[PDB]
C-alpha cells in the first residue's frame, strides 16, 4: 500500500462500488445477523402479489427527513449549470447532450451520490424482494430514477420489463418502485394491468408503437393494437387500475406485467425511483458486457462481480 498524504486519509474512492458496505448516512447501519428477522412481510401480501402481479407495502419505508435529502440529491443530479461530479461513472443519462428535456433519468446512480448508495441496502425492501424470489439470495442489477417536468410532463406507454432483459436466461427478477413525492393520476402515478403477467403462458407481447407528439389519451389507447380477442375478454374482466402513492410508499411489480405512467399536469416536477433485483441461479446468454463498461462473462456464465453486489443473504 502506497503512502497516502496526510490531508487525504479520509476521502473516498472515485466509484462508490468499492466500499463493500453501507455508508453511515440516512439510516444508521445494517442490523445484526439476528436482527434481520423483523422486516418480514406478511404472507397475505405475497399471495396478493402472486395473484395481481403487483402489491403495495403496508407502511412507508422512508421518512420525510430522509426523502427530502434524497430529493435534494435527485435535484442536484440534474444541474445544467454545474455538472454533477462523478458524472462519468453513470451508465447513461439524458444530459449527455448537455440539453436535457421534459424528462430526466439516470441509471446506475448509486455509484455517483451518497445516501442513494445507502438506499440499496435498506432492509425493509431487500428482505421483501428476497421473500418474493422464493427465499434466496438477492443481487442488485441497476437502479434508475425518473423526474418529470412541469405541466408539460410527458408520459410512458405500456411496457413489459423483461423486454429489456433478454440477456438473462431465466425469468427470475423483481422490481421495487419508490415514490419520492405525492403522486396522482393527474401528476404521474402508474397504471398497470392487474393480470397482464399471466397471459400467453408467460410469452412476451409484441412491442408497442408510439408517437412523440400525440396526446396522452392516444398513447394510452394503443393497448388494443397488441392484445387479441382472448386477451380482450380478460381486459373487460380486468380493467386497468391506477394506484395513488404518498411520500414514501413502495410498490412491488413483476417483470412480465404491463405497466405505464401518466404525464405531469401539476405546477412542478415529480420524482420516482426504480430498483431491479435478481435472485440466484441466474446466468448470462451471450459473450460480452451486460452493461457498458462492466465485467465480461461467458455464454453460460453465472452473473456476479463488483458491479452487481450481493445485498441480503438469508442464513
Amino acid at each position: 500500500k502506497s503512502y497516502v498524504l496526510k490531508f487525504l486519509r479520509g476521502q473516498l474512492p472515485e466509484d462508490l462500488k468499492d466500499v463493500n458496505g453501507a455508508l453511515g448516512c440516512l439510516y444508521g447501519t445494517l442490523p445484526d445477523v439476528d436482527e434481520f428477522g423483523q422486516f418480514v412481510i406478511s404472507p397475505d401480501v405475497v399471495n396478493s402479489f402472486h395473484q395481481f402481479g403487483y402489491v403495495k407495502m403496508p407502511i412507508p419505508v422512508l421518512d420525510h427527513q430522509q426523502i427530502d435529502k434524497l430529493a435534494d440529491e435527485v435535484n442536484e443530479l440534474a444541474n445544467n449549470v454545474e455538472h454533477h461530479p462523478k458524472t462519468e461513472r453513470l451508465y447513461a443519462t439524458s444530459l449527455a447532450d448537455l440539453t436535457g428535456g421534459p424528462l430526466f433519468f439516470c441509471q446506475g446512480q448509486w455509484r455517483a451520490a451518497w445516501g442513494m448508495h445507502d438506499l440499496i441496502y435498506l432492509p425493509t425492501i431487500t428482505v421483501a424482494a428476497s421473500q418474493i424470489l422464493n427465499n434466496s439470495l438477492v443481487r442488485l442489477w441497476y437502479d434508475e430514477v425518473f423526474m418529470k417536468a412541469a405541466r408539460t410532463g410527458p408520459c410512458v406507454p405500456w411496457q413489459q420489463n423483461y423486454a429489456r432483459w433478454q440477456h438473462t436466461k431465466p425469468v427470475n427478477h423483481v422490481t421495487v418502485m419508490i415514490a419520492l413525492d405525492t403522486m396522482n393520476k393527474d401528476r404521474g402515478a402508474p397504471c398497470l394491468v392487474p393480470g397482464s403477467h399471466r397471459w400467453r403462458e408467460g410469452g412476451l407481447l409484441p412491442p408497442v408503437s408510439y408517437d412523440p407528439t400525440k396526446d396522452e389519451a392516444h398513447q394510452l389507447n394503443t393497448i388494443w393494437e397488441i392484445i387479441n380477442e382472448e386477451e380482450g375478454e380478460m381486459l373487460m374482466d380486468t380493467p386497468p387500475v391506477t394506484v395513488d402513492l404518498r411520500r414514501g410508499e413502495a410498490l412491488l411489480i413483476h417483470p412480465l406485467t404491463l405497466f405505464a405512467t401518466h404525464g405531469n399536469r401539476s405546477l412542478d416536477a415529480v420524482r420516482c425511483c426504480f430498483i431491479h433485483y435478481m435472485g440466484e441461479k441466474t446466468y448470462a446468454v451471450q459473450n460480452g458486457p451486460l452493461l457498458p463498461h462492466t465485467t465480461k462473462f461467458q455464454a453460460d456464465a453465472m452473473i456476479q462481480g463488483p458491479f452487481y453486489p450481493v445485498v441480503f443473504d438469508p442464513a
Binding site: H64, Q65, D68, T182, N184, L267, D268
Partner: protein
C-alpha cells in the same frame, strides 16, 4: 369533515395557484391558533413550502417573509427567503436603497458586493435625503459592519448640520452607531459628543444607554464628557433601571475615575437593585465592582444570594471570571465555589480548550479541589483536547494540573512533544512543563537535552531566586551537559561576587560547577 379533506388533498397534490400573500395568511393562522392540524401534517407543509418557493416574493414586506421562513423552520424544513436585486436606473431614489439595506439586515443574510454598489450609487443623490433618513441609514450601515469611514463621516456632517430636525432618540442612535466605526476622525467624535452634551434636558432612561455604550467603547479619552453625564445622573440615583446603573459601573471601570465620591453613591444604589439583573449584567456588574475594589461583606452576601440563583445553570463562558473574582476576595464564599465546581463538572464534554485551561488554572491552590473528582475527569479531557490547545492554554492547564497533583506520566511527555514545535517566548511559558515533568523525575534523555538547550538562552533574564528553581528542576531531571550550568553560573556571579556560606546548597554546588 369531508370538504376539508378535499381541500387538503388539493393543497398537497400541488395544483392550487397560491400567491405569496395567501401563504403568509395561512402561515399566520397556523402560527397563532392552529386549532386544526397544520403543523402536524408534514405533506401539507411540504406543499405549502413548494408553493412559497416557486411564487414571487416581491409583493411582501421583509418582516412577513421573515415570519414565513420562521414558521417554516419550526416544523423541520429549512427555508430561506429569496434575495433582492439592486434597483435599476429610473427606480433609484433615497428610499429604495434604504429598503435594500434594511432587507439585507433583517433576513440575517449579508453581502459585500451589493453594499459596495449601493454605497457607490448613494453618493451622487445624497442631497435628496430627509433629515430623519440619515439617522436611519447611519445605524443601518453600522449594523452591517461596513468599515467605510468617509461615507459615514459625510452622513455625520449632514446630520449635525441638521441638528434641530431630530428627536432625542435619533441623536442617541446616531452616537451609539457612530462609536462602532473604527476609522472615524476624532474631531467629528468630539463634535458629536458636544452635541450630545447640549441635549441633556430631553433624555429618557433608555436614551442614556446608547451614550454610555459609546463612551465605554471610546474610553477615557472623552473623560470630561462622562463627568457631565454622571453629574446629571446625581438627580436620579434614587430610582434607575438596574441596567442603567450597571452601565454606569462599567463606564466607571473602563474610565479610571479618580473620584470615589460619586462611585460610592452609585454603588450603594446598585446594591439593592441588582436582584433584578439577568445573567450577563449580573456577571459584569460583579466584574465592574471588583475592578474598582469595593466588594465588602455586606454587598458580597447580597450578590452571592443573587448569583446562587443562576449557579445551577451557568453558561460555561461566565464561570471562569466568577471563580477569578471570588479568588481575590478574603471573605468566606466556599458554597458558591462548590456549586460552580459542580456545574463545571457537567459541562466537561462541551467545554473548549481555553475555558478548561483557565478553569483548571484558577483552581491551582484550592484545597477542597484536591479531592473533588475534577482532578481526574478534567485531566482525561485534557488528554484529548491537547492537540488544539495554544501555548497559553497549554501552560495554564499544565500549571493547574501539576499544582493539583495529577499523576499521569505520559501526559507531560505529550505536552513536551507538543510544545517543542511551538517554541517559547518566556520563562513563564516553560515553567509548567518542567514542573509537570518533576512529578516523576525521569524521561527519555533526548527531550532532556532539548529542554536544556531551551533553558540555556533564558538564563540571562530570571533573577537570583528563579535560578534556584531552574537548578532544582534541572538537577532532578538527570541533566548532564555543562554549557547550561555555566550559563546559569555566570548570571549568579553577576549578583554575588564571591562564594559564601549564605547561599543554599544548590547555589554552592552551582558555583563550583
Amino acid at each position: 369533515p369531508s370538504a376539508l379533506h378535499l381541500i387538503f388533498e388539493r393543497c398537497k397534490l400541488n395544483l392550487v395557484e397560491f400567491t405569496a400573500q395567501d401563504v403568509y395568511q395561512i402561515c399566520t393562522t397556523a402560527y397563532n391558533m392552529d386549532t386544526l392540524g397544520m403543523l402536524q401534517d408534514p405533506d401539507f407543509m411540504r406543499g405549502l413550502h413548494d408553493a412559497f418557493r416557486r411564487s414571487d416574493q416581491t409583493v411582501i414586506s421583509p418582516f412577513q417573509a421573515n415570519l414565513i421562513a420562521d414558521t417554516f423552520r419550526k416544523v423541520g424544513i429549512n427555508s430561506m427567503p429569496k434575495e433582492v436585486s439592486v434597483p435599476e436606473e429610473d427606480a433609484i431614489s433615497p428610499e429604495s436603497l434604504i429598503l435594500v439595506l434594511r432587507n439585507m439586515n433583517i433576513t440575517k443574510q449579508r453581502d459585500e458586493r451589493k453594499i459596495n454598489e449601493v454605497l457607490k450609487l448613494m453618493f451622487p443623490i445624497l442631497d435628496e435625503f430627509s433629515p430623519t433618513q440619515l439617522s436611519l441609514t447611519v445605524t443601518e450601515l453600522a449594523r452591517l459592519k461596513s468599515t467605510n469611514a468617509d461615507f459615514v463621516g459625510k452622513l455625520a456632517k449632514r446630520i449635525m448640520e441638521y441638528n434641530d430636525d431630530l428627536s432625542a432618540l435619533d441623536i442617541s442612535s446616531a452616537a451609539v452607531s457612530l462609536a462602532y466605526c473604527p476609522g472615524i476622525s476624532h474631531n467629528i467624535l468630539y463634535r458629536m459628543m458636544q452635541i450630545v452634551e447640549e441635549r441633556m434636558g430631553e433624555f429618557q432612561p433608555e436614551d442614556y444607554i446608547n451614550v454610555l455604550h459609546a463612551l465605554n467603547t471610546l474610553g477615557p479619552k472623552f473623560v470630561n464628557t462622562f463627568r457631565k453625564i454622571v453629574e446629571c445622573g446625581l438627580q436620579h440615583v434614587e430610582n434607575m433601571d438596574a441596567v442603567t446603573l450597571t452601565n454606569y459601573m462599567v463606564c466607571f471601570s473602563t474610565m479610571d475615575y479618580k473620584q470615589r465620591e460619586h462611585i460610592d453613591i452609585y454603588a450603594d444604589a446598585l446594591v439593592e437593585v441588582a436582584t433584578d439583573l439577568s445573567e450577563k449584567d449580573l456577571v459584569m456588574a460583579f466584574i465592574a465592582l471588583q475592578r474598582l475594589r469595593l466588594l465588602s461583606d455586606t454587598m458580597f452576601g447580597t450578590m452571592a444570594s443573587c448569583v446562587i440563583r443562576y449557579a445551577a445553570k451557568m453558561d460555561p463562558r461566565n464561570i471562569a471570571p466568577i471563580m477569578d473574582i471570588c479568588s481575590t476576595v478574603p471573605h468566606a464564599s466556599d458554597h458558591l465555589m462548590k456549586v460552580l465546581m459542580d456545574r463545571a463538572v457537567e459541562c466537561t464534554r462541551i467545554l473548549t480548550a481555553n475555558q478548561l485551561g483557565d478553569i483548571l488554572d484558577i483552581l491551582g491552590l484550592y484545597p477542597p479541589a484536591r479531592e473533588h473528582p475534577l482532578v481526574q475527569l478534567f485531566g482525561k479531557q485534557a488528554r484529548l483536547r491537547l492537540d488544539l490547545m495554544g501555548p497559553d492554554a497549554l501552560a495554564n492547564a499544565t500549571r493547574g494540573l501539576a499544582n493539583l497533583g495529577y499523576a499521569d506520566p505520559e501526559y507531560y511527555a505529550q505536552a513536551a512533544e507538543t510544545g517543542f514545535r511551538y517554541g517559547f517566548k518566556d520563562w513563564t511559558l516553560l515553567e509548567p512543563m518542567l514542573m509537570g515533568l518533576s512529578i516523576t523525575g525521569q524521561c527519555p534523555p533526548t527531550m532532556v537535552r532539548v529542554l536544556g538547550s531551551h533553558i540555556a538562552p533564558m538564563a540571562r533574564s530570571m533573577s537570583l531566586m528563579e535560578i534556584e528553581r531552574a537548578n532544582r528542576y534541572l538537577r532532578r531531571l538527570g541533566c548532564e551537559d555543562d554549557f547550561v550550568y555555566k550559563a546559569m553560573a555566570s548570571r549568579v556571579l553577576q549578583f554575588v561576587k564571591e562564594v559564601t556560606p549564605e547561599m543554599p546548597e544548590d547555589l554552592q554546588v552551582l558555583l563550583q560547577r
